[PDB]
Amino acid sequence: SRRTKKVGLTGKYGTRYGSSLRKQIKKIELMQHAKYLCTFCGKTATKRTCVGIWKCKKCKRKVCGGAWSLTTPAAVAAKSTIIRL
Amino acid sequence: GSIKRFRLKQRLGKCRRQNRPVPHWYRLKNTKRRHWRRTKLGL
Amino acid sequence: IKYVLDCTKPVKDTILDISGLEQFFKDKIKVDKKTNNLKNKVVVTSDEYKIYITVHIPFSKRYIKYLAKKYIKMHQIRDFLRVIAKGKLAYEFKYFQ
Amino acid sequence: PKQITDIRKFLKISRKPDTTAVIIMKKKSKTVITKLKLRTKKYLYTMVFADRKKAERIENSLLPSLKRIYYP
Amino acid sequence: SLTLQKRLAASVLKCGKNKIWMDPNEISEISLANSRFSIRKLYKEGLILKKPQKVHSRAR
RNA sequence: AGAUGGUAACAUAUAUAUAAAUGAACUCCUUUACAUAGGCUUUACACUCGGGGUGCGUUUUCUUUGCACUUUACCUUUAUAACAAACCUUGGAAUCAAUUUACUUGGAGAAGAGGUUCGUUGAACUCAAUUCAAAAAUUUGUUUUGUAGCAAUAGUAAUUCGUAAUUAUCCGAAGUGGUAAGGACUAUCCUUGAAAAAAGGAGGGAACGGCUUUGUGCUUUGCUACUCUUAAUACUUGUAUGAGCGUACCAACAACCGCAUCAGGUCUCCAAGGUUAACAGCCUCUGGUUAAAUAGAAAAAAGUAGGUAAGGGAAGUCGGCAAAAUAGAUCCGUAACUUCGGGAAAAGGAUUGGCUCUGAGGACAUUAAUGUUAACUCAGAACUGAAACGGACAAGGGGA
RNA sequence: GAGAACUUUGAAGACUGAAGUGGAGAAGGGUUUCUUGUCAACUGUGAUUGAACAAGAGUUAGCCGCUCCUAAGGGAUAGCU
RNA sequence: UCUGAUGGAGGAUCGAGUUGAUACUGACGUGCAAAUCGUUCAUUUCAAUCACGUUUAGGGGCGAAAGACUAAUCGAAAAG
Ligand SMILES: [Mg+2]
Ligand SMILES: [Mg+2]
Ligand SMILES: [Mg+2]
Ligand SMILES: [Mg+2]
Ligand SMILES: [Mg+2]
Ligand SMILES: [Mg+2]
Ligand SMILES: [Mg+2]
Ligand SMILES: [Mg+2]
Ligand SMILES: [Mg+2]
Ligand SMILES: [Mg+2]
Ligand SMILES: [Mg+2]
Ligand SMILES: [Mg+2]
Ligand SMILES: [Mg+2]
Ligand SMILES: [Mg+2]
Ligand SMILES: [Mg+2]
Ligand SMILES: [Mg+2]
Ligand SMILES: [Mg+2]
Ligand SMILES: [Mg+2]
Ligand SMILES: [Mg+2]
Ligand SMILES: [Mg+2]
Ligand SMILES: [Mg+2]
Ligand SMILES: [Mg+2]
Ligand SMILES: [Mg+2]
Ligand SMILES: [Mg+2]
Ligand SMILES: [Mg+2]
Ligand SMILES: [Mg+2]
Ligand SMILES: [Mg+2]
Ligand SMILES: [Mg+2]
C-alpha cells in the first residue's frame, strides 16, 4: 500500500513545520535524494555527498554541482555560452 | 591522589615529620600539630 | 563394565549388613525411570565385603554413591560413614576420620 | 616458546653453545609421553615424543655439559 | 580481636570474609596467628574453614 | 654494480633468529587519522543446557537427585582452517542474472570455474608429528600421540600419608544473545566529523669492488676472494643495557568539598540467577554489611509516613488541591477536526491463571521415503477453581 | 575486659541485591594504610572499638603511567606600541 | 492507482537512568541540609548530557535575556 498521498519524503517531519514549508522541502528533498545520471560512466549513480559535491558510486568521480540538484540552470547556461564561444 | 609530583610528595613527608610530638626527654631540660582530617595542608 | 563397593570397614564392625544392601540396590536401581527392571541390563552380586554392579546401560558411578548414602540414612549410619572413590570403578566406605 | 619437529634441527640447536639447560618432562598420557625442552638464550624450544625409548636415546645423545632439569 | 586473622584468611583462601569460619573453641590458638603462613597452617588443621556456599538451586 | 618465482592478483630468505632482495639529492603518497544513526553478521566473554568424573547437601516420604569444581594467560610474522570483503585469470551474460535482513552489482565484463590478498579470529582444520606401505626426481593410505608450543611443573576440587610428600581429576556434545570488539554495508547533514611526532611505501637513479706499486683526495700499472647481512667474541676509546619521577590508603558508607565522623554534592569501567519487553520494580547467588550522633519500656493525645471505610459521590474548596480510579499484553473498535503527516493508546469494548493436549514455524544426512536433532515464539481445544488470573511488583484517568 | 545493646568469635534471623556500603581507578585528601601498644580528650549513648593517642613500620617497573607529539589554547623571540 | 510485506526516517511517541524541579504551596524550617527529604512530576539521539582541558574579568565579562550568572557575594564581585 502506498502510504502517504501528498507528503512523500516529508513524512519524517510529521505534523510540525508549516505545510507550505514541507511542500518546498519536498521539491528540494526529491532533488537531493535522486540518483542522477553520471556524465562519465553513464550509470545513474551520482548521489550527493556534501552540499555542492556529487559522487558517482561507479567511477568515484566527485562532480561539483548544485546544493540540491546536480546541475543548476544558470550554470548550465554559462557552460552553453562557453561552448558556443 | 595516587600520582604526585616529587616536590608535592616531599612536602607531604615534611608535614608528616612536623606532625610528630615533642620527644619526651626534651621536656626534662606541641601547639602546631595538625590532624589530617580537621585541618588541611592546603597544598 | 563393573562398579564396585568395598564395604569392608563397616561390614567387619557388623554395622553394615550386605544382604540388606543388595536388596536395597535391587529395589532402587531405576532403568529408564522404573525400579523393578535390572533385566539383561544390570547385575548385582556380593562377596562377604564387596558388592559388584555390572552394567550394559548408560549408568553413573554417582548413582551408586547416592544409593549408598540413602541406605546409610535409612539405617542411621550417617555421622560415622562416608562413600569415597578409590579407583575409577571402585567406591569404598570410609570412616568419618 | 617454540616447538621443534625436525629431530636434526633440535640436535643442531643443542650443539649450539648458548643452550644452557635442558628440561625433560614425563607425562601420563590419556603410556609415558616425554617433552624435551631446550632453554636457549632467546627461546625455549620443545619437542614432543610419543615413544619413550626414542626420547631416552635422544636424551643420551644430548651433550653432557647441559644442565639437565628433571621436572616431576 | 580476630579481625586481622579473618582478613588474612580471606586472601589466603580466596573467599570473602563473609565466608570464613573461625572455630569458637580455640579462639586462643587462632589469635596467635599473625601471619599468612600460620593462617595456612590453621586451615590445614581445621581451625579455619571456608564455609559452604549458600545454595542457589536451578531446580524450580 | 645490485636474487628469483607466479599468466596475474601477488608470493619467496623458516639461518638458534625470515637477519640480508644496492640505493644519495630531491619529490609524492600512505599509515598515524577519526561524525552520528540503523540494523545484519562474525568471534570472544557471560549465561545456560545435557552427559561423564570428583566431593559436599537432602533423605518420615519422594528425588539416576540439588550444589560446588571440572581451569588455561601474553608470547610463537603464532602454523593452518573458516568467513565478509577487495582484486586476478578464465568465461561472455536479455527469456536479464547474481544477490542482501536492507540494496547492491554487471560489456568500465556479470554468473559459473579456479586463484591472490587484507581483515577478523588465534589450534579451527587431520593442524602438526609419528606408524608402516605404494608412486615421482617427493605425493596417497592406515595408526598412535600432542589440552600445538606456552602447559602442568601452575591453578581448582578431591584423596590420603607424614610432622612437607604421594596419588586420582581436569572432558565429549549444544543452546541463549546480555556485554564488548571487529566486519561488510545502508542512511542523515545548509552538521561531512582534529592535528602532529613517528613510521612505512613508492618515484628517482647520486655513488660504487679490495689489496700492492708509481706521480701530483686524483690518475696510471698488476693480482683475485669481494660487497652485504644478522649473531657472538676480542681489544683500545671516560666506566658501552634499560635514566628520573609516581606506585601505601580512602574515593565517601566516617579518609574529598559542604565550619563536622553533615540523609547534600562529586567523573569513569566491570556487572550474576529468577520474574520481565527491560541494565525497570520485586526476590535470590558471588562479594559486602547486620552499621548508621543512643538504647530500653510503655503504647494516650498530638504529629508525621501510611492503610481501610456503610450509603452518597465534589455537596468540600479559590480551584477535584490530595487521594482514588486508569494502566501490561492480545484481539476488536477508533469521532470531530486536520497543515492529510496526525488526532490515536482517541473514545469504548472483550480476553488474560493452572493443568492436560493439539496444530504451525528449522537445521543437518542418508537415499520421493527414512533418520539424528534445536530453539524459543505463535495459534487453537478440553478440564480446572469460592469467577480468579498483567493476582505481588510494575503500570495513561478520559472526554467536550 | 574493672566494666560490653553498638569490641571479637560462633549460632540464628535479616538487608545490600551487580545502576550494590561489591571490585578497580580519576579529581581531592595525605599517611587516614599496616602491626604492636592503647584510652586524657575526641569517636554528640556506651566503648575494652576507632579514620583518636603513642611507638615503630610500609609504596620496589625498560613493558602501568608521567616522560615524547601535537589540539583548543598559553608564555615568549623580532619588531611595533 | 490500490493491497501485503520489506525498509527503518524523525530536534516522532512512552520510558528506567541521567539532567532537572511541576505539584503536594507534603515533610523539614533552633533542619541531615545557609535549599535537604519524600512521593508526584518534566527530560532521554539531540539546540542532548557529563568530564577534563581551555578562552573571556569588574563599569568588565558571559547571558535561547531572568538584570540572570560572574566561588553562599551582583540593578555593578572580592581584596586591600
Ligand atoms: Mg593531587
Ligand atoms: Mg573536610
Ligand atoms: Mg597440578
Ligand atoms: Mg594501590
Ligand atoms: Mg557523607
Ligand atoms: Mg572550608
Ligand atoms: Mg568494601
Ligand atoms: Mg553518619
Ligand atoms: Mg465511602
Ligand atoms: Mg459515580
Ligand atoms: Mg460551600
Ligand atoms: Mg462548589
Ligand atoms: Mg491530583
Ligand atoms: Mg555510635
Ligand atoms: Mg534482600
Ligand atoms: Mg529493598
Ligand atoms: Mg587501621
Ligand atoms: Mg561518646
Ligand atoms: Mg589498632
Ligand atoms: Mg594519628
Ligand atoms: Mg606503556
Ligand atoms: Mg618538540
Ligand atoms: Mg595552537
Ligand atoms: Mg604575552
Ligand atoms: Mg519553582
Ligand atoms: Mg512546604
Ligand atoms: Mg517542627
Ligand atoms: Mg553567588
Curated annotation (Swiss-Prot), chain A:
InterPro entries on file: Ribosomal_eL37/eL43 (IPR011331), Ribosomal_eL43 (IPR002674), Ribosomal_protein_eL43 (IPR050522), Ribosomal_zn-bd (IPR011332)
UniProt keyword terms in alphabetical order: Cytoplasm, Metal-binding, Ribonucleoprotein, Ribosomal protein, Zinc, Zinc-finger
Record keyword Coiled coil present: no
Zinc finger (C4-type): 38-59
GO CC annotations, alphabetized: cytosolic ribosome; ribonucleoprotein complex
GO biological process, one term: translation
Pfam families: Ribosomal_L37ae
Record localization: Cytoplasm
Molecular function GO labels: structural constituent of ribosome; zinc ion binding
SUPFAM superfamilies per record: Zn-binding ribosomal proteins
Gene3D superfamilies in the record: 2.20.25.30
Function of the protein: Component of the ribosome, a large ribonucleoprotein complex responsible for the synthesis of proteins in the cell. The small ribosomal subunit (SSU) binds messenger RNAs (mRNAs) and translates the encoded message by selecting cognate aminoacyl-transfer RNA (tRNA) molecules. The large subunit (LSU) contains the ribosomal catalytic site termed the peptidyl transferase center (PTC), which catalyzes the formation of peptide bonds, thereby polymerizing the amino acids delivered by tRNAs into a polypeptide chain.
Protein family: Belongs to the eukaryotic ribosomal protein eL43 family.
Subunit description: Component of the large ribosomal subunit. Mature ribosomes consist of a small (40S) and a large (60S) subunit. The 40S subunit contains about 32 different proteins and 1 molecule of RNA (18S). The 60S subunit contains about 42 different proteins and 3 molecules of RNA (28S, 5.8S and 5S).
Name under which the protein is recorded: Large ribosomal subunit protein eL43
